[PDB]
Design an enzyme around this catalytic site. Structure first.
Site, PDB file in Angstrom:
ATOM      1  N   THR A  61      -4.529   2.330  -0.599  1.00 45.05           N
ATOM      2  CA  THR A  61      -4.493   3.623  -0.239  1.00 45.05           C
ATOM      3  C   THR A  61      -3.308   3.818   0.963  1.00 45.05           C
ATOM      4  O   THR A  61      -2.751   4.083   1.654  1.00 45.05           O
ATOM      5  CB  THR A  61      -5.357   4.451  -0.107  1.00 45.05           C
ATOM      6  OG1 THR A  61      -5.074   5.777   0.035  1.00 45.05           O
ATOM      7  CG2 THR A  61      -5.953   3.798   1.025  1.00 45.05           C
ATOM      8  N   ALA A  96      -3.202  -5.959  11.810  1.00 40.65           N
ATOM      9  CA  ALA A  96      -3.392  -4.697  13.179  1.00 40.65           C
ATOM     10  C   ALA A  96      -4.763  -5.322  14.492  1.00 40.65           C
ATOM     11  O   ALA A  96      -3.769  -5.607  15.409  1.00 40.65           O
ATOM     12  CB  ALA A  96      -4.484  -3.667  12.320  1.00 40.65           C
TER      13      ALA A  96
END
Lengths: 249, 238, 201, 86, 245, 216, 73, 233, 213, 246
Positions: C1, C49
């Site tokens: 996703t 990240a």
């Protein structure tokens, strides 16, 4: 200094017993008759009331019949001293279980929480074990009517009929002789219990000052915990007493 | 006796025999000599092992970039104390960032060692430590007891049959002060060998040196440069 | 996703696909780097990240499982790696978060794939990905992906996906690190550049 | 450890039991055993032997005698309390 | 009694029918073993004279020293076991340091002495630990509280003295103080006196050999606890030697 | 950067070091918001006999560091077996107290100038109220870092190791200038000199206000 | 010094060094350490006690039962 | 009475002298460092065929490339091994590479002697453990065999034996085992020495062998491998 | 990146180029805490062995705290692991600091530039949040891409042959260092005084001060 | 706590006293036998001392630690049940089993529980003023594999897997009769495994189906504790098989 004084009573013996539990075991035997019998509509406890004088206040419900919960009740064989701290603790545990589960606590669930504490004293710490052995009577949803016995290290056993205290061998054998595994009703069950207490005890006619009998009876789907009053007890004494009279003839 | 059941058990004289008896444990340990000049602090040590077919694990321990220790006594206890000292030395380097004082560090060992000797139902630590350290006030070589008292020496030998080695230390006591690094190490070897019998003379294999000083930080020579100090042999000077 | 460590299941293997990337997505701080790390030979994972955060939680997951697997002499499953990561990370939360690891191993009930994210989501699906840009990617891939793809057959699938992905994607200074995991082993198929695969395919 | 083997060898000379019984095997099987305990092993070995109705002790009787000594005898033994005083 | 496994010297919670505590008493016999430390109050400071035990042949100064600085202007001379003395130095120095931080004025000796004594006394009560095997003096000069001398024993008493001795020779040494007028007297003259008392009292069986250490804390040091100069030590040493002959 | 709101502020303290001495002018006067509560305040502390430190920024905050430094020094001196306050020891220790407070979202602001003389080296150091240590040539503190320091640096560039006297005229000159450019100043200022004698900081001495210029 | 006169000794060995090492001795023991060192000395073939004999001498009079090498070092 | 904490006039502690004896009680373990790798051999010494021989273990893993054989009370050692497992992976989180034989051994040894029987914290020992451990593996540095004692004295070895045969075996190793003996020959040397302390002959159900060799992780030898060394002893 | 609030700024820009065994680390020669630069002297760089040279820059309060710590971690590592400080020291320290600075946001980029104690050269880059990677180009500060590019273009030689047709030598890297620093002053306005480039080898520490051009 | 008085201190015999005192207390009585099958593992205890007036339904001497881990215990004296002593080990082990299943998604293995018993005994040893439990437990269960296992522990904390073992009233005697009964058919047929437990218990003292309680586990399914009525039918069928072989 400190170890020398410590008698090493917390040590294991080769045979596989704890010296303290064994010495506590004797403390229960000196002390009075506490017997519990199973019946098929309720269950009953009979304990020796040892507070006879003509000047008695009766500030407590009883000094041996303790209602631990609003679905359990118990009787005592052992020392009143140990019995008082213990009886309070038994109340917090019974009551918390009642909060979470909201159904009557098993008699088995009730002996086990305490057991850890009993064991703790004996094995280590050099702390005395409690001088009382408790007969818990109850009804819980799962098994139906039950009676549980705890010992001075929390050793447990489920019993249909059992007795500890003074003339423990005599009471349990006699009760074994007439009744074997749940052959009687609630009515007859009070009459045996008082009969056993009668033989074991020095007064051989009893009154309600000598015996105190407590019933725990399941009525309209809810457990009722009632300490029977002196008036109800005299009726039960006359029923056993009369049964003894026929025996002779 | 019963002047040594616990380390709280006094003798009528007014002495705890267990703390004294803990010193006898230091004598079971391996011989270590501590010497100082005016620029270096030198530690000469005996390493023993069970396999001599394998390299011998050091008996010189790391405490600071200019502090090293040599142990005589109980091996586990010396390492046990070492960690308290190591934590403090490295902490001292963060906070104070001087090259930490031998006199300061040693007193803190004195507070911790006192704890079990003060305490009932316990054993003292029976390990004697010789610490070499270099601060900006020059070298110091300190001896710390199984008790908690310290000596600031110019030379000391604690360990097995340490008397034999002191006879050498007493004799060249004046010399230690003037020396450079090389000279300190040769004297400590000549001292070290004496503890042991007449007919045993050291090998580099069982010698570890912890060298501390002004021209250097912390370097441990296990056989690295051990061979030139050993040279110029002298065998058991009476 | 989402990207940054992504896995999709097959019978024969799982596909392990990952990015080499440094920093946020706005610039790299290096060019040479591989952020791909092998915590156990059970599979590979690596993110980006919030960098300290992904490495921290996986390192705990790696510690617990590896000790248990190695000492016990019992192989740890997809389910076990996932349960350790989950339990740890919610507790640690409030100390930055951004873990995006894909857990694989073959189990008694057959091959199991769980997707571990830092929200506390634990998901099985056709293909799942945790990190950022694969979110777009799961759309085209599902079409070109069978329930059970062979390893060789799967390698060709990755090459086409990617080759169009570089054209769409505008993130530079990356490599596609391709690993197929055959169970409790991990082998590296190829570590091909994203710029190379557009020409090939 | 070496000394315990020597107590076996001295005791065997008194006995008229096999020399095909390894003195060493007994010594390793019961370490941390005093002088009295090594003589009880020989004694025990003989007890099994009389019941069977043998005149000579066996290695079978011997093996059994040490494993009973290491486990059971330790609890009774004098040494933990006397050695603490010593 | 002294050889036993329960109570007596194991405990100190024990009492005899006399009332005695034997362990606390055994701690007192321990302070007695080593040489004397004297500390003399002047109306202007304290002067110490300490025998510094020479336990080897490879000595350097300050080795096994018994002079400590509790506070900037407090000196501490110990007598008896040095092991117990090091732990006592840390506790006293710590109570003083925090005092200076908070109050911001020179620690009153009367306060410091009460706190260390309480600590020694907590151990003498207890049978759980032994009590320190040394006895100490704290001596000080300030103009915020005056010149003070205090003494703390292994029991846990603090009382002020104007001239004190701890260690083996103390019954002899103390007598020499009654001879001297020391309550009013410069710290310069009193150094000469502490040095001569020590030299005569020493003998080769209280301890093998000593190194003379005298210390200042008075008008001369300007209220600082410091060790005396090389000059001061030697003239005071000389006067000790000349009086010894 | 952030700094707490300051009420009682110490501002402009110059320090430049000469051989085996430093000369400093620091205001002796600490304004509290508006009102000059103490025109007589001392920003100078004694760590030990050959150290001095002078600090700027929130005066309040300076006193917190003084006590921690004080308690550590009290234990460490007097004994002097090998342990005592030393030039390196005071600089780093004081930096760490400041770092400790930097970790919390409120930090205690003082910016300090240490002149010390330790075991062999004469040191002139700068310590920040968030931490950091270095040896320094000339440093300003508080308001001196933004406002006069560059013109003081420019005079230092030909000769970086000049005399006490040359420093003394600059510092005396700097108060007439202080009044001119910044507001929370007084002209009773303190001259502090750290030397081998000790740390000396006599009382506030003054010279001209000189804001009476208007000539263009 | 008294004891030494009775046997025969080196002047490279005295008690003072042994006294400095450990204080775990007494006057009865000091006699015993001199008598102990002489047994070894005699066993070797010597008309004296030397520094080696004394140094061993202190260790022998005190019991062991398995000794040390890398048990403590 | 007297305590156990006390030092004796010998100059050693009582509890510790007992703990060495505890090492002597158990089963023998041999750990040989060869430069081709490190082999650890231990005797099963089973007395019943109803036992499953795989699950009698006395070689347990500290690390994934360090193996450890332990001797004396089997139970007492196991706790030290439990704490060791947590440290090796912990070492991986911090350093970002796997623990060495030296680092792990010094850290467990600190715990080995701490003992204060009365007036000591229940989070600390009342008595020392009677176990000797042999940590044998090959790590970043190379093949290393370290020996740990219950006295908390750690030392580097090439050939060490501990258990009932500990002094006897250790002498006998020094003789056969050298660094001019290869890894397979080390396995043959251990097998011969093993037999006196064993009650029976050597078999593949009466030894357990595991070797950690360069470039490889820890391998537990399978029945075939055990049987090839049994053929020629 | 982030605009100084959490911790004090102290500007400065770090460039790093790795060759094969010579690595240049450059940062400006200044100590800042305030908008002005206190003194040119610095102790941002600290050497632990000739094997490893660390540079912590930016906020001065951060710079001193971590660098000393790195000296402690080195000491611990030589003792226990028995590998001398180098690559191994570097990976370990970046994890513990980067946890410490990143909830209250990181304002120091420590760069360990060394050789492993087994050999092979590593240049290590943290963002400020734990990552360690080996690089042949590195840019670090707020301007964490301004130097990176020159090392990407010139060192890697990706679409470039006019800095070298291959890969830079030791002689070539030092020539390039002086040039790069002169360039930086033009773009980045947060500097004063001098720029210091330290060249770290396994066999030679080099230091050079270079004036701000 | 304040109690730190010695109960265990190390022996030169190279043992811990309590552990050995416990070991003989499992020699002298409370027969517990376990056999491992090929779908199902069955453990059995003989004695709850049902004197024909006691309850049989609610009494547990076999306690389910988990739904795939169960233990049967023994150690006896004059204080005959040491149910109390067991009850601690049972409660801590119960949480730990469940706990292991939350963290690690494999169902907890018997090998995990056995290391956990070895550390509980030991931990009690090292802590001041504390003493090892006397219990020995026959830990039964299922792994990740779904393979039936039977493991046995001793009071020291050392564990071995065993196909069939007997402890109590002569551990070796009951096991050597039982050794003949352990055959390839016996382990394969599930029904024959239930009989194998009962058949061993009968050797020491014969008869009683109320005295004998045994609990059965099949796959990772929950513990089922069998009715005494099921036991009585089974002892009757076992007694005839003995006459058939012999």
């Amino acid at each position: 200094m400190s170890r020398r004084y410590d008698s090493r009573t917390t040590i294991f013996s080769p045979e596989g017993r704890l010296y303290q539990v064994e010495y506590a075991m004797e403390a229960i035997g000196h002390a009075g008759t506490c017997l519990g019998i199973l019946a098929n509509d309720g269950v009953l406890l009979a304990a020796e009331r040892r507070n006879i004088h003509k000047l008695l206040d009766e500030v407590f419900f009883s000094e041996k019949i303790y209602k631990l919960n609003e679905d359990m009740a118990c009787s005592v064989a052992g020392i009143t001293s140990d019995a008082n701290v213990l009886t309070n603790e038994l109340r917090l545990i019974a009551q918390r279980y009642l909060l979470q589960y909201q159904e009557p606590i098993p008699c088995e669930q009730l002996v086990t929480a305490l057991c850890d504490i009993k064991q703790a004293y004996t094995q280590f710490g050099g702390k005395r074990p409690f001088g009382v052995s408790l007969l818990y009577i109850g009804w819980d949803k799962h098994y139906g009517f039950q009676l549980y016995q705890s010992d001075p290290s929390g050793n447990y056993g489920g019993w249909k009929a059992t007795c500890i205290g003074n003339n423990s061998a005599a009471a349990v054998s006699m009760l074994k002789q007439d009744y074997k595994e749940g052959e009687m009703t609630l009515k007859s069950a009070l009459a045996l219990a008082v009969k056993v207490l009668n033989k074991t005890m020095d007064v051989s006619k009893l009154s309600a000052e000598k015996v105190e009998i407590a019933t725990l009876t399941r009525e309209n789907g809810k457990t009722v915990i009632r300490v029977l009053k002196q008036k109800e007890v005299e009726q039960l004494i006359k029923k056993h007493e009369e049964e003894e009279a026929k025996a002779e003839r | 006796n019963q002047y040594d059941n616990d380390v709280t058990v006094w003798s009528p004289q007014g002495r705890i025999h267990q703390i004294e008896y803990a010193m006898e444990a230091v004598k079971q340990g391996s011989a270590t000599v501590g010497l100082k000049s005016k620029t270096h602090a030198v530690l000469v040590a005996l390493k023993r092992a069970q396999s001599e077919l394998a390299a011998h694990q050091k008996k010189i321990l790391h405490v600071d970039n200019h502090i090293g220790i040599s142990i005589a006594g109980l091996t586990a206890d010396a390492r046990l104390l070492c960690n308290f000292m190591r934590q403090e030395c490295l902490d001292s380097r963060f906070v104070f960032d001087r090259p930490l004082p031998v006199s300061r560090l040693v007193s803190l060992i004195g507070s911790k060692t006192q704890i079990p000797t003060q305490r009932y139902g316990r054993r003292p630590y029976g390990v004697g430590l010789l610490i070499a350290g270099y601060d900006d006030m020059g070298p110091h070589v300190f001896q710390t007891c199984p008790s908690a008292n310290y000596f600031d020496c110019r030379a000391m030998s604690i360990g097995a049959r340490s008397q034999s080695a002191r006879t050498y230390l007493e004799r060249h006591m004046s010399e230690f002060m003037q020396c450079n690094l090389d000279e300190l190490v040769k004297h400590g070897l000549r001292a070290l060998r004496e503890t042991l019998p007449a007919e045993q003379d050291l090998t580099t294999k069982n010698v570890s040196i912890g060298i501390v000083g002004k021209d250097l930080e912390f370097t441990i020579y296990d056989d690295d440069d051990v061979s030139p100090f050993l040279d110029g042999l002298e065998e058991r000077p009476q | 996703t989402t990207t940054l460590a992504f896995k999709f299941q097959h019978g024969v293997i799982v596909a392990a696909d990952s990015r080499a990337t440094a920093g946020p997505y706005i610039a790299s701080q290096t060019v040479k780097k591989v952020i791909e790390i092998n915590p156990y030979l059970l599979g590979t994972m690596a993110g980006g990240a919030a960098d300290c955060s992904f490495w921290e939680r996986l390192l705990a997951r790696q510690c617990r499982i590896y000790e248990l697997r190695n000492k016990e002499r019992i192989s740890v499953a997809a389910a076990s790696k996932l349960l350790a990561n989950m339990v740890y990370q919610y507790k640690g939360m409030g100390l930055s978060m951004g873990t995006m690891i894909c857990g694989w191993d073959k189990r008694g009930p057959g091959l199991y794939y769980v997707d571990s994210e830092g929200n506390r989501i634990s998901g099985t699906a056709f293909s799942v990905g945790s990190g950022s840009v694969y979110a777009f990617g799961v759309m085209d891939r599902g079409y070109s992906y069978d329930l059970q793809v062979e390893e060789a057959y799967d390698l060709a699938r990755r090459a086409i996906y990617q080759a169009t992905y570089r054209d769409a994607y505008s993130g530079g200074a990356v490599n596609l690190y391709h690993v197929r995991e055959d169970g409790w082993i991990r082998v590296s198929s190829d570590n091909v550049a994203d710029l190379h695969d557009k020409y090939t395919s | 450890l070496e000394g315990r083997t020597h107590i076996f060898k001295i005791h065997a000379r008194s006995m008229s039991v096999e020399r095909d019984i390894r003195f060493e095997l007994l010594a390793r099987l019961c370490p941390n055993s005093t002088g009295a305990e090594i003589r009880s092993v020989c004694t025990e070995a003989g007890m099994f032997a009389i019941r069977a109705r043998r005149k000579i002790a066996t290695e079978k009787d011997f093996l059994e005698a040490v494993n009973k000594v290491i486990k059971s005898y330790a609890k009774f033994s004098a040494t933990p309390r006397y050695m603490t005083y010593n | 009694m002294s050889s036993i496994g329960t109570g007596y010297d194991l405990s100190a919670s024990t009492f005899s029918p006399d009332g005695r505590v034997f362990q606390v008493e055994y701690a007192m016999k321990a302070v007695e073993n080593s040489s004397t430390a004297i500390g003399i109050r002047c109306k202007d400071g304290v002067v110490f004279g300490v025998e510094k035990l020479v336990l080897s042949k490879l000595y350097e100064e300050g080795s096994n020293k018994r002079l400590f600085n509790v506070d900037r202007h407090v000196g501490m001379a110990v007598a008896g076991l040095l092991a117990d003395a090091r732990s006592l130095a840390d506790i006293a120095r710590e109570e003083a340091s925090n005092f200076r931080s908070n109050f911001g004025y020179n620690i009153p000796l009367k306060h410091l002495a009460d706190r260390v004594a309480m600590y020694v006394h907590a151990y003498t009560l207890y049978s759980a630990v032994r009590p320190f095997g040394c006895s100490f003096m704290l001596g000080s000069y300030s103009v915020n509280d005056g010149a003070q001398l205090y003494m703390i024993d292994p029991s846990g008493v603090s009382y002020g003295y104007w001239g004190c001795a701890i260690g083996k020779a103390r019954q002899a040494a103390k007598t020499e103080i009654e001879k001297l007028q020391m309550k009013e007297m410069t710290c310069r003259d009193v150094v000469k006196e502490v040095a001569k008392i020590i030299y005569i009292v020493h003998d080769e069986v209280k301890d093998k050999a000593f190194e003379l250490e005298l210390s200042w804390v008075g008008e001369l040091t300007k209220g600082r606890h410091e060790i005396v100069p090389k000059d001061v030590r030697e003239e005071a040493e000389k006067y000790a030697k000349e009086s010894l002959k | 950067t952030q700094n707490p709101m300051v009420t009682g502020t110490s501002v402009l303290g110059v320090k430049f070091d000469c051989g085996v001495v430093i000369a400093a002018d620091m205001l002796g006067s600490y304004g509290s918001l508006a009102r000059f509560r103490n025109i007589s305040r001392i920003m100078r502390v004694n760590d030990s006999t050959m150290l001095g430190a002078s600090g700027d920024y929130a005066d309040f905050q300076y006193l917190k560091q003084v006590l921690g430094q004080m308690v550590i020094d009290e234990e460490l001196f007097g004994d002097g077996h090998s342990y005592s306050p030393r030039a390196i020891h005071s600089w780093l220790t004081r930096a760490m107290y400041s770092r400790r407070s930097k970790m919390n979202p409120l930090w205690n602001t003082k910016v300090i100038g240490g002149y010390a003389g330790g075991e062999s080296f004469l040191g002139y150091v700068d310590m920040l109220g968030v931490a950091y240590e270095a040896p320094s040539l000339a440093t300003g503190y508080g308001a001196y870092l933004a406002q006069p320091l560059l013109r003081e640096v420019l005079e230092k560039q030909p000769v970086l190791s000049q005399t006490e006297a040359r420093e003394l005229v600059e510092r005396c000159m700097r108060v007439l200038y202080y009044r001119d450019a910044r507001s929370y100043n007084r002209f009773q200022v303190a001259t502090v000199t750290e030397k081998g004698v000790e740390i000396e900081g006599p009382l506030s001495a003054q010279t001209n206000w000189d804001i009476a210029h208007m000539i263009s | 010094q008294i004891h030494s006169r009775k046997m025969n000794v080196s002047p490279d060995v005295n008690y003072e060094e042994l006294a400095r090492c450990t204080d775990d001795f007494n006057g009865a023991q000091c006699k015993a350490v001199c008598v102990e060192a002489g047994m070894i000395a005699l066993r070797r073939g010597a008309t004296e006690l030397t520094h080696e004999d004394y140094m061993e001498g202190i260790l022998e009079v005190q019991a062991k039962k398995k000794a040390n090498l890398q048990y403590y070092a | 009475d007297r305590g156990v904490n006390t030092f004796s006039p010998e100059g050693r502690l009582f509890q510790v002298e007992y703990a060495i004896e505890g090492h002597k009680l158990g089963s023998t373990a041999i750990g040989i460092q060869t430069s081709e790798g490190v082999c650890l051999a231990v005797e099963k010494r089973i007395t019943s065929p109803l036992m499953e021989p795989s699950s009698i273990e006395k070689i347990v893993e500290i690390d994934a490339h360090i193996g450890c054989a332990m001797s004396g009370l089997i139970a007492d050692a196991k706790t030290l091994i439990d704490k060791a497992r947590v440290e090796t992976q912990n070492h991986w989180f911090t350093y970002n590479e796997t623990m060495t034989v030296e680092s792990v051994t010094q850290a467990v040894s600190n715990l080995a002697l701490q003992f204060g029987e009365e007036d000591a914290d229940p989070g600390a020992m009342s008595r020392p453990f009677g176990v000797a451990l042999l940590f044998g593996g090959v790590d970043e540095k190379g093949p290393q065999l370290f020996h740990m004692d219950p006295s908390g004295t750690f030392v580097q070895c090439d050939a060490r034996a501990i258990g009932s045969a500990s002094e006897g075996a250790q002498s006998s190793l020094q003789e056969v085992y050298h660094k001019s003996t290869t890894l397979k020959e080390a396995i043959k040397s251990s097998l011969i020495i093993l037999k006196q302390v064993m009650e029976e002959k050597l078999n593949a159900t009466n030894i357990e062998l595991a070797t950690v060799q360069p470039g490889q992780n820890f391998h537990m030898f399978t029945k075939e491998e055990l049987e090839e060394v049994i053929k020629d002893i | 990146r982030f605009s100084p609030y959490a911790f004090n700024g102290g500007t400065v820009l770090a460039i790093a180029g790795e060759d094969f065994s010579i690595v240049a680390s450059d940062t400006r020669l200044s100590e800042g805490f305030s908008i002005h630069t206190r003194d040119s002297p610095k102790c941002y760089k600290l050497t632990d062995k000739t094997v490893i040279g660390c540079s912590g820059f930016h906020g001065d309060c951060l710079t001193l705290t971590k660098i000393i710590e790195a000296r402690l971690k080195m000491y611990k590592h030589s003792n226990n692991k028995a590998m001398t400080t180098g690559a191994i020291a570097a990976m370990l320290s970046t994890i513990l600091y980067s946890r410490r600075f990143f909830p209250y946001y990181v304002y120091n980029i420590i760069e360990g530039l060394d050789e492993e104690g087994k050999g092979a050269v590593y240049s290590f880059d943290p963002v400020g949040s734990y990552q360690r990677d080996s690089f042949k180009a590195g840019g670090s500060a707020s301007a964490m891409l301004q130097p990176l590019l020159d090392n990407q273009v010139g060192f890697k030689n990706m679409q470039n042959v006019e800095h070298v047709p291959l890969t830079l030598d030791r002689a070539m890297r030092l020539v390039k260092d002086v040039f790069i620093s002169a360039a930086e002053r033009d773009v980045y306005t947060g500097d004063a005084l001098r720029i210091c480039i330290v060249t770290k080898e396994g066999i030679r520490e080099e230091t050079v001060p270079l004036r701000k051009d | 706590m304040s109690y730190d008085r010695a109960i265990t201190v190390f022996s030169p015999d190279g043992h811990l006293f309590q552990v050995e005192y416990a070991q003989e207390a499992v020699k002298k009585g409370s027969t517990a036998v376990g056999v491992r099958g090929r779908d199902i593992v069955v453990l059995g205890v003989e004695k709850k001392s049902v004197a024909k007036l006691q309850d049989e339904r609610t009494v547990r001497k076999i306690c389910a630690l988990d739904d795939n881990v169960c233990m049967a215990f023994a150690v006896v004296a004059s204080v005959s049940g040491l149910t109390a002593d067991a009850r601690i080990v049972i409660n801590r082990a119960r949480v730990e089993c469940q706990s292991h299943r939350l963290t690690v998604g494999d169902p907890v293995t018997v090998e995990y529980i056995t290391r956990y018993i070895a550390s509980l005994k030991q931990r009690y040893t090292q802590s001041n003023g504390r003493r090892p439990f006397g219990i020995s437990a026959l830990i039964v269960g299922f792994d990740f594999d779904g393979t039936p296992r039977l493991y046995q522990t001793d009071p020291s904390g050392t564990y071995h897997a065993w196909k069939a073992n007997a402890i109590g009233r002569g551990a070796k005697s009951v096991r050597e009769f039982l050794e003949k009964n352990y055959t390839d058919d016996a382990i394969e047929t599930d029904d024959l495994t239930i009989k194998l437990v009962i058949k061993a218990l009968l050797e020491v003292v014969q008869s009683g189906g109320k005295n004998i309680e045994l609990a059965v586990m099949r796959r990772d399914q929950p513990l089922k504790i069998l009715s005494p009525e099921e036991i009585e039918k089974y002892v009757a069928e076992i007694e005839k098989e003995k006459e058939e072989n012999e």
